[PDB]
Design a protein around this nucleic acid. Sequence first.
DNA 1: GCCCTGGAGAATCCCGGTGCCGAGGCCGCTCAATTGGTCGTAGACAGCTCTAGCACCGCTTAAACGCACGTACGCGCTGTCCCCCGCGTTTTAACCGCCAAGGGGATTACTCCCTAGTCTCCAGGCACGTGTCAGATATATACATCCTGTGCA
DNA 2: TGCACAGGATGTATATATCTGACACGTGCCTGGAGACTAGGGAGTAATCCCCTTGGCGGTTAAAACGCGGGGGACAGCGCGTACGTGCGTTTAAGCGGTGCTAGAGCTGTCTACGACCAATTGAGCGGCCTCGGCACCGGGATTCTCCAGGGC
Lengths: 98, 98, 110, 110, 98, 98, 81, 81
Amino acid sequence: KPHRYRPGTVALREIRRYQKSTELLIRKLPFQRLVREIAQDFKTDLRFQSSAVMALQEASEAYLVALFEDTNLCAIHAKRVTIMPKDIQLARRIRGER
Amino acid sequence: KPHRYRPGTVALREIRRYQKSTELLIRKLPFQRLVREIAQDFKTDLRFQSSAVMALQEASEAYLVALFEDTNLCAIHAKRVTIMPKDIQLARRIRGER
Amino acid sequence: TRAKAKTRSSRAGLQFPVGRVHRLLRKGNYAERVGAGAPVYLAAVLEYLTAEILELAGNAARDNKKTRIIPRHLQLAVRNDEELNKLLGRVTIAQGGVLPNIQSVLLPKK
Amino acid sequence: TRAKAKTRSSRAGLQFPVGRVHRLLRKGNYAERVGAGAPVYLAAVLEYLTAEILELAGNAARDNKKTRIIPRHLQLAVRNDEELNKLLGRVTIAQGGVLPNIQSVLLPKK
Amino acid sequence: KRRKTRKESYAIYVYKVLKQVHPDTGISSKAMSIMNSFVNDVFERIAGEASRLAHYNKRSTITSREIQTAVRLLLPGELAKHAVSEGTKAVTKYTSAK
Amino acid sequence: KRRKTRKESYAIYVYKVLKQVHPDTGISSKAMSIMNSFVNDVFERIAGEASRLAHYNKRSTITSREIQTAVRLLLPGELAKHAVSEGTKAVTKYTSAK
Amino acid sequence: VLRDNIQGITKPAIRRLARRGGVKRISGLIYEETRGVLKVFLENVIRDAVTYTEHAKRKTVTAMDVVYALKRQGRTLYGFG
Amino acid sequence: VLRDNIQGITKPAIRRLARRGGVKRISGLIYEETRGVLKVFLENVIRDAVTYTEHAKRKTVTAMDVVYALKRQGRTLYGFG
DNA sequence: GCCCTGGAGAATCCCGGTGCCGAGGCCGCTCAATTGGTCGTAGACAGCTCTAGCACCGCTTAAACGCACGTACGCGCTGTCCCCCGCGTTTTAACCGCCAAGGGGATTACTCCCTAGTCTCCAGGCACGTGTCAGATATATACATCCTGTGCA
DNA sequence: TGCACAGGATGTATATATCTGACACGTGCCTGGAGACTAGGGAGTAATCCCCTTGGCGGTTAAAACGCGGGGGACAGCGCGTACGTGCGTTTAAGCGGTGCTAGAGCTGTCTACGACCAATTGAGCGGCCTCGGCACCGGGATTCTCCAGGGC
């Protein structure tokens, strides 16, 4: 009988790991393609500094992480442990983004 | 025999009435005594312009009404119709005040 | 002899005061120098934004059968228009009240 | 002969540049004039806040057996100190990470 | 017989604009005070953004295009494009006049 | 061939303060960049508030008093009282010297 | 010297505020929480306003002191100058 | 021309972000919601950064443009100048 | 027995007359905006250098993806009970109208000292080199932890 | 028969050795900060006025406080089914390292036209001052909404 951790052990291990580390969590080339594609709609033939893309990714990831913390609070408020789109929407509504 | 409305009819009526209206909902003299008491701790023998006291009351009531809107959303999120201190605390935490 | 004086607002076709906006820019610690077209542009923008808010507020006042705009009508204009409500999102309008809004789950189960 | 030059930072007993702060105040479009004590006061305050952050960050670096402060140590310092966390409440420190916080309702049952 | 000091406001220009958009419509003094603080608020927002634009680009002068970039930054979308249209039309008309 | 144009930072001053508080601790280039941006940000906040203070009171000059009031408006509690003590001490020493 | 004036923000007053906020049903524990929240809010605003008053070397808190305090805390208020 | 790059923000990446956010369990509908949220955020920030870039008459979006846009949206970033 | 009308009863709205006080128009007047020149420097522009951004390409492997399985979590349903709503009564103090005193905000005048401006001079600070050591990277090991089966009170 | 260790597998914290590149320090030089003045106006100060804040007082009534059913909503429990977590094998593109090319960022030198400034002039805007009509208010009747008690399917 092969070893299996129970459903939540590896999740908590991941939480500890990624709250311990600081490296970016999105892949850099996919994120850069996303940025360039979004910027295409505002002006054609735009160039980007490497540091401009890195600053965009730092900010985007900090924003998404803080949003996930608020979302986790809203999911716990409803006596769940599973974050859901309604949690995300409530968090962004209370923040004043929707 | 005596006529009774059911529990929530008059609450909805009051909601409609106070959302139609615009007048302040706290009593002026208690609010003013509160303001002067709070200011005692910052500086003694302070005087207040009547318009300063009124601006404070407008700001305070606007703040509390928006806070109760967010609290109502938090309570509905947890499948309730009753706002609770934990709903207020969640709203203020998501806003970034506590 | 000197020519007849024309306000810069009249030259620009504006109701807002270009000369006053110019002086407020010059004495406002914004930059060392203020170009000639900056007050014209800013006054035109201010007049346009005023016109938007006042048009929606006059509509709101007529809807309540009033011939005189009050803060309630200003608030109803601002919070009902999406972009004005985004512009004035962190602003409290005194005596404005709130938008009538009851969450649907609170209504009676009819 | 003129006197031997002495920096204003040394007269105020500071490490932060009083003269450079004075220049940045004069050329920052903050007022028409800048008093002589304004840059001194501002350099003292900037130096105090810097020393507070650096003290906490050096503690945090030492608590990881590191000798060089890194963004992670700065972030730990700021988010662990209550008033610094309030001052930098809407600031994002690049490569700073987050604080190790797990909601207790998520932990396994004993 | 001490005449009060002169206090400038936009009230007369707000009243002219109102008589343009709604000829048979007046305005109370409280609503006019709100409109005055709105004009002042937006003036300060646009002027501050133009100021820091000029500083970012190491310029000494606030020009029509600094005002235009500030409008495009601060106003939401359709508001921004109609405002840019009004502003450039006014600057063109003023330049043609004198 | 040609040296880059000189770009002023607070790095040497932050490093002197660091050698005061932790004589043996160093700092990375990224952490120094964060410290430099922090100093610039705090400077901008305090100077903006002092500027506004001078404007509200129809003054032409930013003085120690404006700076101190800006510090009391911007810093929370204990940070504010300690910063005020540092500022008054530095100004007293500066005027007693020359 | 004033004392215990927060109780002057009565339970019906808090209920009226929550009605304007669209709230239909109110826990009995909401009122003390609301008083604490309002006291914290007023303490912040009034501290900033009195700082402005002291800087102006005045002894009277003005509507402009309140408006500047509110604007500094990101709660701009129209209708008081 | 680039197309469909938001799917480059993968489910494992979103899960890693949620883990750093402290989330233990993620509903399967979170990933599209999060991609939309990230797209909206990036659109606001990049629109402002390109506004700063165009005002300077550059064709290259700079780290400083991004920092200024983030600051204008009340999301000050340290570490990029 | 459960549900649909149908009147009571309460609340809200719609009309109309009153009256008042604030919006709105008007009148001096003064001070700030306009006119008309002068000037000096900020910025527009052209040319040039060379940084770094883009593009590509091969390879290695870390990460993504797709799938299977099971379990624990979300969610619906039920029941209890208690706590909050609706309402009638009694009490309290807000509110309003008025009067009066004087604290202090606001203004005026004046005078001086503090700051801008200038010019000269040099040293603090920046860019650039350079070397070594703090930290990043294996690497093997000693735990620390999770999980299930098992023995047992 | 449900509960606590045994131990095994797994993961992570922890010495230990290599190595390298980024940090810290030294050097040269140049530009901006200091020193030494002068000029003028911003502001510190004193005197004065009046207004508007505070304090009081008494009458009226709206509103708060209180108490009392009672219902309906909060919450706890329970069951069930599915959807998410874990792990495993396969695929795929990210990352990395190099090479190459040129777009455009960044700097520099010219020069002009645009804005500050200044003095004279005057009308636009402000305070003050009436004054009437839009709105508040009050009362009364019409309409709508809520709700439960009984008639009917």
